Write a protein that holds these residues in place. Structure first.
Motif, PDB file in Angstrom:
ATOM      1  N   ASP A 136       0.500  -1.332  -0.046  1.00 26.27           N
ATOM      2  CA  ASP A 136       0.180  -0.089  -0.417  1.00 26.27           C
ATOM      3  C   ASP A 136       0.917   1.052   0.233  1.00 26.27           C
ATOM      4  N   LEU A 137       1.915   1.493   0.950  1.00 28.30           N
ATOM      5  CA  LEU A 137       2.733   2.267   0.859  1.00 28.30           C
ATOM      6  C   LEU A 137       3.867   2.463  -0.552  1.00 28.30           C
ATOM      7  N   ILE A 138       3.811   1.365  -1.796  1.00 24.68           N
ATOM      8  CA  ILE A 138       4.346   1.407  -2.150  1.00 24.68           C
ATOM      9  C   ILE A 138       3.233   1.876  -3.993  1.00 24.68           C
ATOM     10  N   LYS A 139       2.082   1.570  -4.227  1.00 19.77           N
ATOM     11  CA  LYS A 139       1.065   2.495  -4.355  1.00 19.77           C
ATOM     12  C   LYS A 139       0.608   3.577  -4.332  1.00 19.77           C
ATOM     13  N   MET A 140       0.984   3.909  -3.437  1.00 18.01           N
ATOM     14  CA  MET A 140       0.458   5.359  -2.677  1.00 18.01           C
ATOM     15  C   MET A 140       1.875   7.025  -3.409  1.00 18.01           C
ATOM     16  N   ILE A 141       2.659   5.695  -3.313  1.00 20.22           N
ATOM     17  CA  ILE A 141       4.029   6.588  -3.334  1.00 20.22           C
ATOM     18  C   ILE A 141       4.196   6.695  -5.263  1.00 20.22           C
ATOM     19  N   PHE A 142       3.998   5.995  -5.760  1.00 17.30           N
ATOM     20  CA  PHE A 142       3.740   5.724  -7.145  1.00 17.30           C
ATOM     21  C   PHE A 142       2.372   6.205  -7.946  1.00 17.30           C
ATOM     22  N   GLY A 143       1.615   6.223  -7.328  1.00 17.95           N
ATOM     23  CA  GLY A 143       0.134   6.960  -7.366  1.00 17.95           C
ATOM     24  C   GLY A 143      -0.085   5.870  -8.221  1.00 17.95           C
ATOM     25  N   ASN A 199      25.594  14.653  20.025  1.00 12.69           N
ATOM     26  CA  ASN A 199      24.265  15.227  20.097  1.00 12.69           C
ATOM     27  C   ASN A 199      23.550  15.007  18.238  1.00 12.69           C
ATOM     28  N   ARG A 200      23.220  13.682  18.132  1.00  3.80           N
ATOM     29  CA  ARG A 200      22.287  12.856  17.332  1.00  3.80           C
ATOM     30  C   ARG A 200      21.198  12.746  17.739  1.00  3.80           C
ATOM     31  N   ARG A 201      20.445  13.327  17.079  1.00  2.71           N
ATOM     32  CA  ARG A 201      18.497  13.252  16.867  1.00  2.71           C
ATOM     33  C   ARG A 201      17.941  12.525  16.043  1.00  2.71           C
ATOM     34  N   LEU A 202      16.505  12.510  17.231  1.00  2.00           N
ATOM     35  CA  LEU A 202      15.369  12.192  16.126  1.00  2.00           C
ATOM     36  C   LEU A 202      14.664  12.746  15.704  1.00  2.00           C
ATOM     37  N   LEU A 203      14.586  13.740  14.272  1.00  2.00           N
ATOM     38  CA  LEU A 203      14.413  14.397  14.113  1.00  2.00           C
ATOM     39  C   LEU A 203      13.186  15.054  13.221  1.00  2.00           C
ATOM     40  N   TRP A 204      12.153  15.049  12.641  1.00  2.00           N
ATOM     41  CA  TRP A 204      10.903  14.944  11.567  1.00  2.00           C
ATOM     42  C   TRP A 204      11.957  15.893  10.206  1.00  2.00           C
ATOM     43  N   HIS A 205      10.645  15.244   9.885  1.00  2.00           N
ATOM     44  CA  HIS A 205      10.905  15.934   8.077  1.00  2.00           C
ATOM     45  C   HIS A 205       9.998  15.493   7.156  1.00  2.00           C
ATOM     46  N   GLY A 206       9.058  16.169   7.092  1.00  2.60           N
ATOM     47  CA  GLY A 206       7.024  17.014   5.877  1.00  2.60           C
ATOM     48  C   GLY A 206       7.726  16.830   3.906  1.00  2.60           C
ATOM     49  N   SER A 207       7.514  15.828   3.260  1.00  2.26           N
ATOM     50  CA  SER A 207       7.241  16.838   2.573  1.00  2.26           C
ATOM     51  C   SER A 207       6.248  15.858   1.222  1.00  2.26           C
ATOM     52  N   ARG A 208       5.688  16.847   0.153  1.00  7.93           N
ATOM     53  CA  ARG A 208       3.988  16.148  -0.358  1.00  7.93           C
ATOM     54  C   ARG A 208       5.023  14.307  -0.801  1.00  7.93           C
ATOM     55  N   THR A 209       3.882  14.192  -0.876  1.00 12.08           N
ATOM     56  CA  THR A 209       3.933  12.192  -1.020  1.00 12.08           C
ATOM     57  C   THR A 209       4.565  11.825  -2.462  1.00 12.08           C
ATOM     58  N   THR A 210       4.121  13.709  -3.172  1.00  6.42           N
ATOM     59  CA  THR A 210       4.869  13.115  -5.259  1.00  6.42           C
ATOM     60  C   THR A 210       6.282  13.366  -4.842  1.00  6.42           C
ATOM     61  N   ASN A 211       6.776  13.176  -3.607  1.00  3.57           N
ATOM     62  CA  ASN A 211       8.676  13.584  -3.523  1.00  3.57           C
ATOM     63  C   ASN A 211       9.191  12.220  -2.965  1.00  3.57           C
ATOM     64  N   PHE A 212       8.199  11.553  -2.306  1.00  3.38           N
ATOM     65  CA  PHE A 212       9.054  10.338  -1.879  1.00  3.38           C
ATOM     66  C   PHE A 212       9.465   9.471  -2.333  1.00  3.38           C
ATOM     67  N   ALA A 213       9.214   8.784  -4.094  1.00  2.00           N
ATOM     68  CA  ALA A 213      10.333   8.343  -4.531  1.00  2.00           C
ATOM     69  C   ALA A 213      11.159   8.964  -4.842  1.00  2.00           C
ATOM     70  N   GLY A 214      11.598  10.030  -5.222  1.00  2.00           N
ATOM     71  CA  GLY A 214      13.287  10.909  -4.537  1.00  2.00           C
ATOM     72  C   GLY A 214      13.795  10.723  -4.145  1.00  2.00           C
ATOM     73  N   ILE A 215      12.582  10.842  -2.509  1.00  2.00           N
ATOM     74  CA  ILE A 215      13.314  11.098  -1.243  1.00  2.00           C
ATOM     75  C   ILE A 215      14.079   9.657  -0.758  1.00  2.00           C
ATOM     76  N   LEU A 216      13.542   9.523  -1.096  1.00  2.00           N
ATOM     77  CA  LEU A 216      14.406   6.968  -0.732  1.00  2.00           C
ATOM     78  C   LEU A 216      14.778   6.608  -1.483  1.00  2.00           C
ATOM     79  N   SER A 217      14.954   6.724  -3.111  1.00  5.15           N
ATOM     80  CA  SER A 217      16.030   6.547  -3.671  1.00  5.15           C
ATOM     81  C   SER A 217      16.997   7.963  -4.350  1.00  5.15           C
TER      82      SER A 217
END
Ligand SMILES: NC(=O)c1cccc2c1O/C(=C\c1ccc(C(=O)NCCc3nc4ccccc4[nH]3)cc1)C2=O
Length: 240
Positions: free
Chosen positions: A10-17, A86-104
């Protein structure tokens, strides 16, 4: 027929539309479902619950799925920063259409031909310690109410702490990152440690910082290698 677990399908279907598993391999990222029952999931749900800002009141958040991610090559890329303090676990949001690029390709710095608009400390990779500050960058709507958000381990080291916009030409000597100081901060007394990374999941309190342009903190790095992406959440936005 996919051989991935249904939440990942379902994640893949969301990312690739292409077949689901072919699209999966294009991400060059290992993706695992985090068990709802687990310590990691409990911590992440608490981070989401506790760090929703009071002024981000147009919606509430519900965690649908939590994924643990490992991008190809990121272990060796991050290696030089893996020992920085000082390594911290932090949030980053982006439009769904950007995630194929962000992950690759991983999170990237805006190129010269991109506008600096919205980047108060110049082009860099931006993170929040308040989930809703990052979630706003998903640009979800009543009509499209599902978004994606990352948790990254960010190697901040010595932070250059600023209160007003400044597009710095270079970090000062000994500094590794910029932190913009907000009026509101997760309660530092509630920080916990997850796999050696600090998680600022305290509820929001007054920071006691005066003379600042920021309601909430933000964190900027200027080297793509200072980011280790660790989790990807699928969020439901319930609009009021
Ligand atoms: N995103 C956050 O979670 C975030 C967390 C904390 C603070 C901030 C947060 O986000 C901010 C700014 C932001 C975001 C996107 C653009 C854009 O999408 N610009 C379009 C131009 C562009 N092209 C790019 C190509 C590669 C990489 C970046 C690119 N930006 C602008 C400002 C913040 O201040």
């Amino acid at each position: 027929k996919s051989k991935l677990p249904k939440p990942v399908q379902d994640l893949i279907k969301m990312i690739f539309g292409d077949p689901i598993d072919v699209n999966y391999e294009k991400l060059k990222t290992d993706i695992k479902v985090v068990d709802r029952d687990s310590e990691e999931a409990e911590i992440i749900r608490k981070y989401v619950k506790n760090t929703h800002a009071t002024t981000h009141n147009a919606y509430d958040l519900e965690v649908i799925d939590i994924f643990k991610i490992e991008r190809e090559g990121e272990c060796q890329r991050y290696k030089p920063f893996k020992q920085l303090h000082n390594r911290r676990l932090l949030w980053h949001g982006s439009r769904t259409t950007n995630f194929a690029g962000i992950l690759s390709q991983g999170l990237r710095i805006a190129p010269p031909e991109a506008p600096v608009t919205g980047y108060m400390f110049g082009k860099g990779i931006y993170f929040a310690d308040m989930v809703s500050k990052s979630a706003n960058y998903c640009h979800t709507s009543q009509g499209d109410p599902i978004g994606l958000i990352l948790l990254g381990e960010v190697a901040l080291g010595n932070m250059y702490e600023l209160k007003h916009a400044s597009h710095i030409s270079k970090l000062p000597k000994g500094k590794h990152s910029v932190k913009g100081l907000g009026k509101t901060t997760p309660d530092p007394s509630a920080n916990i440690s997850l796999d050696g990374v600090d998680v600022p999941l305290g509820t929001g309190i007054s920071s006691g910082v005066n003379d600042t342009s920021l309601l909430y903190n933000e964190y900027i790095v200027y080297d793509i290698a200072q980011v280790n992406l660790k989790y990807l959440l699928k969020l439901k936005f319930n609009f009021k």
